[PDB]
């Protein structure tokens, strides 16, 4: 039964199976993403994945992010829940768990590029189009794409996110 764990790319058979499963969920739910691209970010050293584990073995969703610790902000790379598990509240519970985790990690802002429907989805999750975080903080660290809408979520130090 349901667990939200931080999946570490430590070269072990167990975690590496879970990362591959999460990666396959990502490419399935994000057809516009080059699959080799999802692989590169998910298994790079800089990235982490918080997954939704059904029991102690099956991946049904997760979020791949990258923390920029000194600057105290993190970028969401990919977010998804497997087809047969969508519309059950998991995606929202994941985001809440993520924010709570980032709060404990001393992260002040969450950033994510969004497109089309995703903008509305992240708005429901607390992200906004206007930023209260200074440009120069992410500039040079996070790529500046003109084709995408950059959204941010302020993580207040003592607001109860997650539950």
């Amino acid at each position: 039964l349901l667990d939200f764990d931080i999946l570490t790319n430590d070269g072990t058979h167990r975690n590496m199976k879970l990362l591959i499963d999460l990666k396959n969920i990502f490419s399935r739910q994000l057809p516009k993403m080059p699959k080799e691209y999802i692989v590169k970010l998910v298994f790079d050293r800089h990235h982490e994945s918080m997954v939704i584990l059904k029991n102690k073995q099956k991946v049904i969703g997760g979020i791949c992010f990258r923390q920029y610790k000194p600057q105290r902000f993190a970028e969401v790379a990919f977010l998804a829940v497997t087809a047969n598990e969508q519309v059950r509240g998991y995606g929202t519970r994941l985001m809440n768990k993520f924010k709570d985790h980032m709060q404990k990690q001393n992260i002040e802002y969450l950033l994510t590029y969004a497109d089309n429907f995703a903008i509305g989805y992240f708005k429901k999750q607390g992200f906004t189009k206007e930023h209260r975080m200074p440009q120069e903080k992410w500039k040079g660290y996070i790529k500046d794409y003109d084709g995408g809408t950059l959204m941010e979520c302020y993580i207040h130090p003592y607001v109860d996110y997650g539950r």
Partner: peptide
């Protein structure tokens, strides 16, 4: 970057 930012793609989740 050899491949690297940490990024998405959802373009209209209604497909």
């Amino acid at each position: 970057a050899r491949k690297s930012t940490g990024g998405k793609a959802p373009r209209k989740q209604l497909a």
